[PDB]
């Protein structure tokens, strides 16, 4: 069970539980502030279908984030993998936060991409985010 990371290869036993989180801080650009781009994994899906799995993610996000409300949703395919893209809004300590989140169906775990910014700053960070996602090639 060889594990591949940007800087090395190594053998990890399968008894070990993967909880890895890829993290990038986006630099400020023009009027917009720093953003973050995070890649997380999820194994909770199980046998439930992607649509109902994706379904359950909003149900939890909609009760747990103060001031939640959903701006957009895509259903697209990334290199044969089903993907849903969500644009939604929530307030942490009275300041408007915007999330752009993509769920990529995969096993043993669903890939999740999360961009955090503000509604105001999303257009300024969107070009670089578009670069990142148009290049995402899942492995078979």
């Amino acid at each position: 069970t060889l594990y591949r990371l940007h800087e090395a290869d190594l053998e990890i036993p399968d008894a070990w539980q993967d909880q890895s989180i890829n993290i990038f801080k986006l630099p400020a650009s023009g009027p917009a502030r720093e953003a973050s781009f995070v890649i997380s994994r999820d194994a909770s899906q199980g046998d439930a279908p992607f649509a109902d799995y994706v379904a359950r993610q909003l149900e939890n996000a909609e009760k747990q984030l103060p001031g939640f409300k959903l701006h957009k949703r895509w259903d697209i395919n990334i290199h044969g993998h089903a993907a849903v893209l969500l644009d939604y809004q929530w307030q942490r300590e009275g300041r408007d936060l915007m999330l752009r989140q993509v769920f990529i169906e995969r096993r043993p775990a669903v890939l999740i991409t999360t961009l955090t910014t503000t509604p105001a700053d999303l257009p300024h960070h969107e070009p670089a985010w578009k670069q990142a996602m148009q290049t995402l090639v899942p492995r078979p």
Partner: protein, 57 residues
């Protein structure tokens, strides 16, 4: 996936409050390592706690 935490994490790292940003290499690794061993949580939850630990000190 905890939307609570992904939002908290993405917010914290944007504002320079990520673990790897506030403490030295050895310490960030050590704080992250303790959080995971200490609940039905995941990587996101762990990294958040590592930063709360790092911040309280």
């Amino acid at each position: 996936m905890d939307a609570q935490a992904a939002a908290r994490l993405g917010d914290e790292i944007a504002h320079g409050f990520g673990v790897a940003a506030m403490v030295a290499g050895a310490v960030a690794g050590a704080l992250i390592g303790a959080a995971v061993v200490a609940a039905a949580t995941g990587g996101l939850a762990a990294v958040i706690l590592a930063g709360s630990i790092a911040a309280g000190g």
